[PDB]
Ligand binder design. Structure first.
Ligand code: NI
Ligand code: NI
Lengths: 225, 225
């Protein structure tokens, strides 16, 4: 009556879609160095979300992406012209979905559950990545931190899931591959499922995730129509 | 009147003291993985400070340091017992000052500049780092984030320098090697010095620092007795 999961809420980047899709195109421009440019870019992208929220300087995710691209190349000593910048950025809008995700999502819906994305992306960025993958019909709501002008893991961002879904905290399973994000949402109050894709270890940020699985299809296997 | 620099506020970790001085202890305990352990430990320490602040779950710098150390080891498959934690964690209370630092501090006071540390450190960790290196006399104020229960670069942290100095925003030159920290102060309102020791590039977080030098020694040489 208040205690059981009714909605599954996903982060977008790194749980549903692979942010290192962009390595292929970094590789073209910087031969030999696709992994490392793209590993740094993502890291500093996440850092800039954190720093701007802590500083009171919100700028949307596309902007933070560019700023992080620019730092990363200057930092690594690499020239990138305007056309490079433009193309590598446009590439964040067409990340590949992880291979378990489409079927996982059909089964979550088949088990009678609402589905939503809660993400640092702009409204546009989210619609591009989901739209470009053809999984537009798989989600009931697509929620952007645009709505509050603060990034994860600010507590006002997690609040948007329950307010959009009109559900209690215990009714929402928040799902993420990133520990620090599951941890934010758990402190907000949602039960949390950590996807441990990599065989790693949870953050020591004071909280143990309710559910741990190796992939979204496992998560899906947990529910019954 | 209220437009000229009167004090120099330093941050501690990575500007005054080398956070990688723990490297030799780490390499002894984890042979062949000591640099990695020292890099990741430090990076996850920073991320936990930013995470706790953003999630409203403050815990002091020493607690963060232990958390990060346990994460780091779990993540690398390195086992560590209770005594090894306590050992390595104690090493962080004894960081090594950069070469240039003590004499640069003697030279900045010799100009009638007030001098403070404003640090993410706890009241104990600050005293212990500054104290064990015998530099306690060179600072007029040791200020910890403990008085606000908020880590950098939250704007309330940067406020404490001007309140404790009883000075104007334009009369404090905040000095850090960490551009994200220099960036946070600048949005605060203080003029910043970015010390660029490693020879890199400043964050694309929308501000440009006011002075750049390569050393605190070089900075000290800009101030007349
Ligand atoms: Ni119930
Ligand atoms: Ni003046």
């Amino acid at each position: 009556g208040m205690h059981a999961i009714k909605a599954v809420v996903f982060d977008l980047y790194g749980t549903l879609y692979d942010v290192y899709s962009v390595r292929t195109s970094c590789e073209r421009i910087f031969p030999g160095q696709g992994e490392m440019v793209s590993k740094m870019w993502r890291q500093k992208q996440l850092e800039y979300t954190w720093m701007r929220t802590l500083m009171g300087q919100y700028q949307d995710f596309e902007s933070a992406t560019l700023d992080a691209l620019r730092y990363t190349c200057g930092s690594l000593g690499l020239a990138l012209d305007a056309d490079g910048e433009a193309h590598l950025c446009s590439e964040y809008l067409s990340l590949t979905p992880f291979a378990d995700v489409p079927q996982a999502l059909q089964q979550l819906r088949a088990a009678g559950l609402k589905t939503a994305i809660l993400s640092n992306g702009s409204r546009h960025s989210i619609r591009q990545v989901v739209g470009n993958s053809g999984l537009t019909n798989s989600f009931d709501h697509l929620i952007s931190v645009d709505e509050v002008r603060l990034f994860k893991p600010h507590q006002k961002v997690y609040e948007l899931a329950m307010d959009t879904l009109h559900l209690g905290e215990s009714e929402i399973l928040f799902v993420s591959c990133n520990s620090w994000d599951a941890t934010g949402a758990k402190y907000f109050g949602y039960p949390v499922c950590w996807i441990n894709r990599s065989n790693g270890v949870f953050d020591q940020l004071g909280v143990v995730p309710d559910i741990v699985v190796s992939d979204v299809g496992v998560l899906a296997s947990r529910f019954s129509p």
